């Protein structure tokens, strides 16, 4: 579970 | 040839910097020195002025919490916003989005706070910090007056800010400087160090050239910023230490999940 990853994947 | 490219890069990093970060250093200094014709800030120097300007200069406001925890919680959510702004900027660095996604996370995990303190200096003088997108100014003195657990929580960022601000960097220098920090090839847990070190080397060269052309009389402004990068690590280290004191010595401590993940280390 990574919030930072979801941030990284958004455009 | 190679330098013209190092200047194009520096300008790209600056253009993306001005997109990711609304309150630039140029605007912040314009407010601190009193040079803007667009209004002025509300000062929070004691408990009474905080109340009058609580709903003012603000980022369900009935918290019923001690003033110290409400301030600290206000810090948490400007950090949450800043982590998102830094991520948008880090993804504009050429070659970043092509890194291993888990290496991106590692670079942001160990880099956001170094960058928050760096850019926090742009909002600080020796007397306080600009808050709420320039709408308010919180005196350094008022932050030390807080209870002993939270009283020495902002003073560290003030000490570094006054020293860092002596270098007189502008938004162009900071854009590259922040990019170099993010692209650190020595963050624990990285899986592919070499591609990160290749990017940082090209960033460090743009920074060195940037500083020579922008601060031609300030010799050794590069070796000074390389030391500041090392300082920022121990500063964040001492900062994380204090947080665990609070988490252990304080109850009713609500922490935003994004910071829980970053702080997990
Ligand atoms: C610029 C806002 C400021 C100083 C801050 C603090 C920590 C940080 O990492 C980023 C920003 C802040 C905001 C709300 C508050 O109640 C107290 C301080």
JSON list of C-alpha atoms in Angstrom, two decimals, chain B residues 43-123:
[
{"chain": "B", "resi": 43, "resn": "UNK", "atom": "CA", "xyz": [0.72, 38.70, 12.07]},
{"chain": "B", "resi": 44, "resn": "UNK", "atom": "CA", "xyz": [0.29, 35.93, 14.64]},
{"chain": "B", "resi": 45, "resn": "UNK", "atom": "CA", "xyz": [2.53, 36.82, 17.58]},
{"chain": "B", "resi": 46, "resn": "UNK", "atom": "CA", "xyz": [0.52, 35.64, 20.61]},
{"chain": "B", "resi": 47, "resn": "UNK", "atom": "CA", "xyz": [-2.49, 33.55, 21.58]},
{"chain": "B", "resi": 48, "resn": "UNK", "atom": "CA", "xyz": [-4.91, 36.46, 21.09]},
{"chain": "B", "resi": 49, "resn": "UNK", "atom": "CA", "xyz": [-3.74, 37.34, 17.57]},
{"chain": "B", "resi": 50, "resn": "UNK", "atom": "CA", "xyz": [-3.91, 33.65, 16.68]},
{"chain": "B", "resi": 51, "resn": "UNK", "atom": "CA", "xyz": [-7.59, 33.58, 17.63]},
{"chain": "B", "resi": 52, "resn": "UNK", "atom": "CA", "xyz": [-8.44, 36.72, 15.66]},
{"chain": "B", "resi": 53, "resn": "UNK", "atom": "CA", "xyz": [-6.52, 35.32, 12.69]},
{"chain": "B", "resi": 54, "resn": "UNK", "atom": "CA", "xyz": [-7.37, 31.65, 13.15]},
{"chain": "B", "resi": 55, "resn": "UNK", "atom": "CA", "xyz": [-10.24, 31.50, 10.66]},
{"chain": "B", "resi": 56, "resn": "UNK", "atom": "CA", "xyz": [-8.19, 34.11, 8.84]},
{"chain": "B", "resi": 57, "resn": "UNK", "atom": "CA", "xyz": [-5.06, 33.03, 6.94]},
{"chain": "B", "resi": 58, "resn": "UNK", "atom": "CA", "xyz": [-6.35, 29.45, 7.11]},
{"chain": "B", "resi": 59, "resn": "UNK", "atom": "CA", "xyz": [-5.38, 26.66, 4.72]},
{"chain": "B", "resi": 60, "resn": "UNK", "atom": "CA", "xyz": [-15.38, 21.55, 10.75]},
{"chain": "B", "resi": 61, "resn": "UNK", "atom": "CA", "xyz": [-12.82, 23.92, 12.27]},
{"chain": "B", "resi": 62, "resn": "UNK", "atom": "CA", "xyz": [-14.08, 22.97, 15.76]},
{"chain": "B", "resi": 63, "resn": "UNK", "atom": "CA", "xyz": [-11.10, 20.90, 16.90]},
{"chain": "B", "resi": 64, "resn": "UNK", "atom": "CA", "xyz": [-11.31, 21.58, 20.67]},
{"chain": "B", "resi": 65, "resn": "UNK", "atom": "CA", "xyz": [-7.56, 20.90, 20.78]},
{"chain": "B", "resi": 66, "resn": "UNK", "atom": "CA", "xyz": [-4.69, 22.61, 22.56]},
{"chain": "B", "resi": 67, "resn": "UNK", "atom": "CA", "xyz": [-3.24, 25.50, 20.55]},
{"chain": "B", "resi": 68, "resn": "UNK", "atom": "CA", "xyz": [0.07, 23.65, 20.27]},
{"chain": "B", "resi": 69, "resn": "UNK", "atom": "CA", "xyz": [-1.49, 20.60, 18.63]},
{"chain": "B", "resi": 70, "resn": "UNK", "atom": "CA", "xyz": [-3.59, 22.77, 16.31]},
{"chain": "B", "resi": 71, "resn": "UNK", "atom": "CA", "xyz": [-0.48, 24.58, 15.06]},
{"chain": "B", "resi": 72, "resn": "UNK", "atom": "CA", "xyz": [1.39, 21.29, 14.69]},
{"chain": "B", "resi": 73, "resn": "UNK", "atom": "CA", "xyz": [-1.59, 19.84, 12.80]},
{"chain": "B", "resi": 74, "resn": "UNK", "atom": "CA", "xyz": [-1.58, 22.91, 10.56]},
{"chain": "B", "resi": 75, "resn": "UNK", "atom": "CA", "xyz": [2.02, 22.08, 9.72]},
{"chain": "B", "resi": 76, "resn": "UNK", "atom": "CA", "xyz": [1.07, 18.50, 8.85]},
{"chain": "B", "resi": 77, "resn": "UNK", "atom": "CA", "xyz": [-1.33, 19.57, 6.11]},
{"chain": "B", "resi": 78, "resn": "UNK", "atom": "CA", "xyz": [0.94, 22.14, 4.48]},
{"chain": "B", "resi": 79, "resn": "UNK", "atom": "CA", "xyz": [3.48, 19.30, 4.36]},
{"chain": "B", "resi": 80, "resn": "UNK", "atom": "CA", "xyz": [0.83, 17.07, 2.77]},
{"chain": "B", "resi": 81, "resn": "UNK", "atom": "CA", "xyz": [0.23, 19.71, 0.10]},
{"chain": "B", "resi": 82, "resn": "UNK", "atom": "CA", "xyz": [3.98, 20.20, -0.37]},
{"chain": "B", "resi": 83, "resn": "UNK", "atom": "CA", "xyz": [4.61, 16.47, -0.81]},
{"chain": "B", "resi": 84, "resn": "UNK", "atom": "CA", "xyz": [2.12, 16.57, -3.68]},
{"chain": "B", "resi": 85, "resn": "UNK", "atom": "CA", "xyz": [3.70, 19.67, -5.22]},
{"chain": "B", "resi": 86, "resn": "UNK", "atom": "CA", "xyz": [7.17, 18.11, -4.97]},
{"chain": "B", "resi": 87, "resn": "UNK", "atom": "CA", "xyz": [5.90, 14.94, -6.65]},
{"chain": "B", "resi": 88, "resn": "UNK", "atom": "CA", "xyz": [4.49, 16.92, -9.58]},
{"chain": "B", "resi": 89, "resn": "UNK", "atom": "CA", "xyz": [7.85, 18.65, -9.90]},
{"chain": "B", "resi": 90, "resn": "UNK", "atom": "CA", "xyz": [9.94, 15.47, -9.58]},
{"chain": "B", "resi": 91, "resn": "UNK", "atom": "CA", "xyz": [7.95, 13.92, -12.41]},
{"chain": "B", "resi": 92, "resn": "UNK", "atom": "CA", "xyz": [8.88, 16.88, -14.64]},
{"chain": "B", "resi": 93, "resn": "UNK", "atom": "CA", "xyz": [12.62, 16.13, -14.26]},
{"chain": "B", "resi": 94, "resn": "UNK", "atom": "CA", "xyz": [13.69, 14.54, -17.57]},
{"chain": "B", "resi": 95, "resn": "UNK", "atom": "CA", "xyz": [14.23, 10.83, -17.04]},
{"chain": "B", "resi": 96, "resn": "UNK", "atom": "CA", "xyz": [12.47, 10.56, -13.67]},
{"chain": "B", "resi": 97, "resn": "UNK", "atom": "CA", "xyz": [9.23, 8.94, -14.83]},
{"chain": "B", "resi": 98, "resn": "UNK", "atom": "CA", "xyz": [11.33, 6.30, -16.62]},
{"chain": "B", "resi": 99, "resn": "UNK", "atom": "CA", "xyz": [12.98, 5.20, -13.37]},
{"chain": "B", "resi": 100, "resn": "UNK", "atom": "CA", "xyz": [11.75, 2.08, -11.61]},
{"chain": "B", "resi": 101, "resn": "UNK", "atom": "CA", "xyz": [8.53, 3.16, -9.90]},
{"chain": "B", "resi": 102, "resn": "UNK", "atom": "CA", "xyz": [9.76, 1.75, -6.59]},
{"chain": "B", "resi": 103, "resn": "UNK", "atom": "CA", "xyz": [12.93, 3.83, -6.94]},
{"chain": "B", "resi": 104, "resn": "UNK", "atom": "CA", "xyz": [10.78, 6.93, -7.51]},
{"chain": "B", "resi": 105, "resn": "UNK", "atom": "CA", "xyz": [8.99, 6.21, -4.22]},
{"chain": "B", "resi": 106, "resn": "UNK", "atom": "CA", "xyz": [12.32, 5.82, -2.43]},
{"chain": "B", "resi": 107, "resn": "UNK", "atom": "CA", "xyz": [13.65, 9.10, -3.84]},
{"chain": "B", "resi": 108, "resn": "UNK", "atom": "CA", "xyz": [10.51, 10.91, -2.70]},
{"chain": "B", "resi": 109, "resn": "UNK", "atom": "CA", "xyz": [10.41, 9.13, 0.66]},
{"chain": "B", "resi": 110, "resn": "UNK", "atom": "CA", "xyz": [13.88, 10.41, 1.61]},
{"chain": "B", "resi": 111, "resn": "UNK", "atom": "CA", "xyz": [13.70, 13.69, -0.33]},
{"chain": "B", "resi": 112, "resn": "UNK", "atom": "CA", "xyz": [10.41, 15.49, 0.31]},
{"chain": "B", "resi": 113, "resn": "UNK", "atom": "CA", "xyz": [11.39, 16.75, 3.75]},
{"chain": "B", "resi": 114, "resn": "UNK", "atom": "CA", "xyz": [14.83, 17.91, 2.62]},
{"chain": "B", "resi": 115, "resn": "UNK", "atom": "CA", "xyz": [13.06, 19.96, -0.07]},
{"chain": "B", "resi": 116, "resn": "UNK", "atom": "CA", "xyz": [10.32, 21.28, 2.26]},
{"chain": "B", "resi": 117, "resn": "UNK", "atom": "CA", "xyz": [12.92, 22.77, 4.59]},
{"chain": "B", "resi": 118, "resn": "UNK", "atom": "CA", "xyz": [14.93, 24.15, 1.67]},
{"chain": "B", "resi": 119, "resn": "UNK", "atom": "CA", "xyz": [11.88, 25.89, 0.21]},
{"chain": "B", "resi": 120, "resn": "UNK", "atom": "CA", "xyz": [10.55, 26.79, 3.67]},
{"chain": "B", "resi": 121, "resn": "UNK", "atom": "CA", "xyz": [13.54, 29.11, 4.01]},
{"chain": "B", "resi": 122, "resn": "UNK", "atom": "CA", "xyz": [12.18, 31.15, 1.09]},
{"chain": "B", "resi": 123, "resn": "UNK", "atom": "CA", "xyz": [9.20, 32.02, 3.31]}
]
